[PDB]
Design a protein around this ligand. Structure first.
Ligand code: NAG
Ligand code: TEZ
Ligand code: TEZ
Length: 340
């Protein structure tokens, strides 16, 4: 089990001003550290954040968090369940800022809620350095859904933070699961992110900000636009027919919809052509890395735990150990190993 620690700096808060925190299981025989960012949509104005506070309060507050959580999937410590990193130090960072991990704004006389996702990540890293992260060789910042987008927005800031604090030997890497979205034409929008950034005081990576400039930082929330600007190594996991993508596209089969779905898969495939570390199966699903049966899906005969191990070796092409795995077949479940 992973044990809850609320942040000692109580000014780094969830939406309602309660302290943020993290769940930790140490592995004293390991110099590898996995920090995982939870997902769960977002909110972007007073009215829809108020609604989220009524029926999704654990995503806005630490007041009701449990003292422990069980690690699953890539967060499991059993080799049978996690062939990749079962002996690592494990950290689960709850998502309680509703800002895709981008915010840097405190609650105040003018702000009903605090949006501090970017600061929560920095403070967790700071406090872990006294609990053994100072001796790490690799820090893998991972996340699913909104947490996968959060990896893309924050991995280079973690790398800069550790450099400026005096830890140049820690290698920072990212693993973004189900957070690679397309700003495509709907079957039947980006305004939500633009409004959110202003409501959250949201921050994006500096090189991407300099490309798109003021008023256009929403572009940096889209993987295919922010990824080329990043310096840390990043592995991208993305279903070709992601259910959250299709929901925003207003898709729930005749010729028009057939062509729409086939075009979505082809566009997703295209955006990953120049991403050398990636895993993109032709399935209709959403998230993968913390579910218990994450080992089952394969692309071209290679599972995701194997592909991640091959990535580790590459950062020391490899014979029989591939790291770029993108399906080419054009319809959901044309890969027999898709989850049911
Ligand atoms: C707590 O975090 C805030 C926001 O990052 C920072 O301004 C403040 O200095 C921190 N407190 C301490 C004691 O470091
Ligand atoms: C349901 C939903 O809309 N999820 C998300 C989360 C983060 C995003 N960043 S860009 N588009 C995104 C969409
Ligand atoms: C024009 C536009 O904004 N299109 C879309 C479509 C699906 C999305 N999923 S997340 N952000 C999305 C944006």
């Amino acid at each position: 089990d992973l044990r809850l620690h609320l942040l000692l700096n109580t000014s780094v808060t969830c939406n309602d001003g309660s302290p943020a925190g993290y769940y930790l299981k140490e592995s004293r025989g390991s110099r590898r550290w996995l920090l995982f960012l939870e997902g769960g949509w977002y909110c972007f104005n007073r009215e829809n954040c108020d609604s989220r506070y009524d029926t999704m309060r654990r995503l806005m507050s630490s007041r009701d968090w449990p003292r422990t959580r069980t690690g699953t999937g890539i967060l499991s410590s059993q080799p049978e369940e996690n062939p990749y990193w079962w002996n690592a130090n494990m950290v689960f960072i709850p998502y309680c800022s509703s800002d895709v991990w981008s915010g840097a704004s405190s609650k105040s006389e003018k702000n009903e809620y605090a949006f501090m996702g970017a600061l929560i990540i920095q403070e967790v890293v700071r406090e872990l350095l006294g609990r053994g992260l100072s001796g790490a060789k690799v820090l893998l910042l991972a996340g699913s859904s909104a947490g996968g987008t959060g990896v893309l927005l924050n991995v280079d800031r973690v790398a800069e933070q550790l450099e400026k604090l005096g830890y140049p030997a820690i290698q920072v890497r990212g693993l973004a699961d189900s957070g690679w979205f397309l700003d495509n034409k709907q079957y039947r929008p980006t305004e939500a992110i633009r409004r959110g950034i202003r409501y959250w005081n949201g921050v994006v990576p500096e090189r991407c900000r300099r490309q798109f400039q003021e008023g256009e930082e929403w572009n940096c929330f889209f993987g295919y636009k922010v990824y080329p600007t990043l310096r840390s190594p990043v592995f991208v996991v993305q279903w070709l027919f992601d259910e959250a993508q299709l929901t925003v596209d207003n898709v729930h089969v005749q010729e028009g919809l057939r062509l729409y779905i086939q075009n979505l898969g082809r566009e997703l495939r295209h955006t990953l052509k120049d991403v050398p570390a990636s895993f993109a199966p032709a399935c209709l699903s959403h998230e993968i890395i913390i579910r218990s049966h994450w080992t089952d899906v394969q692309v071209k005969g290679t599972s995701l735990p194997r592909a991640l191990h091959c990535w580790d070796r590459s950062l020391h092409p490899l014979k029989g150990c591939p790291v770029h795995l993108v399906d080419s077949c054009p319809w959901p479940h044309c890969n027999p190993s898709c989850p049911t």
